[PDB]
From a paper:
The potassium ion efflux channel GORK plays a critical role in closing plant leaf stomata by releasing K+ from guard cells to reduce guard cell volume and turgor. The GUARD CELL OUTWARD-RECTIFYING K+ (GORK) channel is expressed in Arabidopsis guard cells and encodes a K+out channel. The transmembrane region is composed of six transmembrane helices (S1-S6), with S1-S4 forming the voltage sensing domain and S5 and S6 forming the pore region.
As a result, five different structures of GORK ranging from the transmembrane region to the C-terminal ANK (designated as GORKWT1–GORKWT5) were determined at resolutions of 3.16 to 3.27 Å. Furthermore, overlaying GORKWT1 and GORKWT5, which had high resolutions of 3.17 and 3.16 Å, respectively, revealed that one of the C-linkers in each dimer was pushed upward by the CNBD in GORKWT1, as compared to GORKWT5. Additionally, GORKWT1 displayed a C4-like C2 symmetry in the CNBD, whereas GORKWT5 showed a pronounced C2 symmetry. Furthermore, we found a structural difference in the short structure that lies between the CNBD and ANK domains, termed as CNBD–Ankyrin bridge containing residues 511 to 519. This region had an α-helical structure in GORKWT1, while in GORKWT5, it was entirely present in a nonhelical loop conformation. The CNBD–Ankyrin bridges of GORKWT1–GORKWT5 contain a mixture of α-helical and nonhelical structures, and these conformational changes appear to be centered around L516.
Author numbering:
A (entry chain C): 306 to 618
B (entry chain B): 50 to 409
C (entry chain D): 202 to 305
D (entry chain A), E (entry chain D): 410 to 514
Write the structure that this text describes.
Amino acid sequence: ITALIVKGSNTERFRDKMNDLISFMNRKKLGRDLRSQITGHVRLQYDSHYTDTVMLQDIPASIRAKIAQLLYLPYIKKVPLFKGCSTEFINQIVIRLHEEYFLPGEVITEQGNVVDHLYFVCEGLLEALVTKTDGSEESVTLLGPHTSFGDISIICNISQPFTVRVCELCHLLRLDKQSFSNILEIYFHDGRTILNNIMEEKESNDRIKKLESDIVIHIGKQEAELALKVNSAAFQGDFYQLKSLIRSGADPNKTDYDGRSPLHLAACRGYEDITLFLIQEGVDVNLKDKFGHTPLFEAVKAGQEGVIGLLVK
Amino acid sequence: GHNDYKYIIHPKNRWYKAWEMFILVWAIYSSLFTPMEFGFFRGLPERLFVLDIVGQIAFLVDIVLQFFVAYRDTQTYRTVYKPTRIAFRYLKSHFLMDFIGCFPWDLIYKASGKHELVRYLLWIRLFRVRKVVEFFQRLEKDTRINYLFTRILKLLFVEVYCTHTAACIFYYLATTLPPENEGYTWIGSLKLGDYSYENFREIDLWKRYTTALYFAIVTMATVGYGDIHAVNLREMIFVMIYVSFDMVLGAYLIGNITALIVKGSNTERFRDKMNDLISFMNRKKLGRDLRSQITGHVRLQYDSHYTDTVMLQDIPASIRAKIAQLLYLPYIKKVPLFKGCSTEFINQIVIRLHEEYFLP
Amino acid sequence: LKLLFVEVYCTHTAACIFYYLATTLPPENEGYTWIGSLKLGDYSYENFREIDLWKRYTTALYFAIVTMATVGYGDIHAVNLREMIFVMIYVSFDMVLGAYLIGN
Amino acid sequence: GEVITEQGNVVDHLYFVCEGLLEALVTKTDGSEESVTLLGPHTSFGDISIICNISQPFTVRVCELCHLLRLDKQSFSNILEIYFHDGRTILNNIMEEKESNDRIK
Amino acid sequence: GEVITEQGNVVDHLYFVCEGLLEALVTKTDGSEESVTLLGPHTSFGDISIICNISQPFTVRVCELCHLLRLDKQSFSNILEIYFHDGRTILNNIMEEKESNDRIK
């Protein structure tokens, strides 16, 4: 019987963790309001025991991704942002998601703040109050289940458009802003899907403010970057990324804003590997930039005798 | 401000809290007196009429009030103010037993030709102990009292209540036999000292109750003097049941007390560290200054709660942020290394910032 | 050691209080006290107020020590209602004390 | 079936495949695994990334009961730097091994 | 009865004898180990091969409860590199006390 008691009960662990928290709060003089919020949140972790993912921490990341693709996957499929997006993008979002539960009344994000976390609303009701210039907050949308907030702010690189408050115990799937941006960059095609989804969302009911004007920015920028990335990797010397960039898209004959193909920069910087790879791509060897310069001229001007010979042959 | 109703009162209202404590005291008394009302009386005397009527009135108004008290929904975590939802919850949860216990069972017993089976329904009022259980569970979530200590005070209340109930049931079992077979009952064959409990139905209620509760308490600690013991077979069966159940109850009591003193305390754990350290301090004959340095190490290790850094590793990122940018942020804002940096970069620095303390 | 000292002290005090509650009753009706009705062996504690001090103390402390370990021989028992009440209180308190001893 | 080391991540743990077969694949951005090597018993991986301080070129995932012998990045480097000499003439030989791979450039 | 270092093995740790009796033994090819000396308190071993950089000169075998202070080879080498004059004084002490062992290198 004593062993059974000493093994511990859920409320006993609640008591210990809460008392530790109260020690830390009082000693750091957090403040009545903040003490109330943190106590409420961890009390939530102890009433619903949603922080049962601690066992998950032991289970390795591959199996964790599998459990993620069994639990978080349906909601993220339903998410309006990830409509028509590639399965790989969906999976990467699911793997990087973290479960959270927020008690009613809690202000998750505040209008004007930097959105460091993009939340997927899964099981709950929230609010989208806009803190106007006067300060009155009108509920833009109820942001019901299977939705997302923090998303337009992260992608459009604008501050938080509206304050989000909790109506009912909400099961949010949090995603770090930086992880979202990295996944967005790594899959540029799925990013294109996100941006057209954002634009078609404007044609739909997304109750957004001001103007987004980013799909067209993405149409220009994704392609212009990918070409630039090719040229910049050539100039820096990143042959390894250059192969992947050429295979991903654009064209090894693509030129920059000044009309410089990657061969020009590879010749100037004396990179025989990149120069050879462009040779197998059949890149123009007499292509001339806005300043009337051929890659042979750049190889000679920099005295890259090996690259000079490669271009001469 | 969602209390548009002038009838539903918030469950944390001060006046309703005072009523809750009042009905807790009445629940304690009524649940302690129901075994006494059942065992030691075959029908209440005229002296206790007003007490009985007033008690059931006090619990009936509690039944009435429970339809006007908001309850925090366990799926939406907001105080449901809807009167029909509140009434539905109370009617389906514990309304029937409160209502049945609120019947004047003594007057019904006397009215129904003095039938013992009617009096056997007095044990429905035992379900008023739900109030006491609720009070204890409310204490255990309140962090001003140690949980295990509350879990043992609850077990002490359970033990007090089981002894009182067992004493009443034991004397009732004595009364079940006709007064002609008094010599075959546990109390009717009692000759403690020179006093003989021959006609035990005529002795004053407190003498009988003190004797029966003496039996219950001494058997609760298994002292078993033997001066008082079972005689009938109904008494053997009841004593066997009570003794077998009390074995497990006392074992659980010992287990809970051992839980308190085995879990230990921060003082105890640090003291164990000190015992080991200061012992090493002595075996090697360390200089008192070096000893002071080591003692200062451990002293700051727990005193600045240096161990206490990762409790909030489970609080969500929003609150984790607010804590960090309300505690570590000012220093970083004034650090010349990050002078001129974006506030968001400083926020990221502060989020993963660790705390450490160093002695001179 | 604190619990052992507390338990020993409580036994001694309980024995003294037990004997005192035996003395509260008038000497005429001593047959209703725990010591006045004692017939241990062939020796009867008849004039319990005239016995040697150490016999009285050893009998009272025997009862206290026995009930402290809850042996409950039964030869000495709370005959009075006041004796019963005191034995009830002691026994209930010592159960918690012994549980604390086992836990420590 | 569990990934040991992930491509695009600087390896901080050199593993010695000693029992059980491991499989090394560079999964493409479209989700297509490309098994580049099959590291059986008495093989090593991660060493390129640590010696280079580059990211892992191929994600390595387990295929049988792979009894491996992990060696930390700081541990290895130390055996060469912190354990000077232990990591000078000998590591030069290790560099000869890596250049004799003939793919490392 | 235990052996600390065996004559011929590469020294990885320099040991100092605080208390207890150790025995340095030259194991010849005759099936026997000539007892070079009985290393006592305040002596040291694993230093001849850590300074003269040679193979362990004698098998050090335990005979009592020896409370040995151990110094890692790398650590000692690093400290010698930092403190060159102290290494001088040490090497001086080696040559002045070359009468300690006849088979000393």
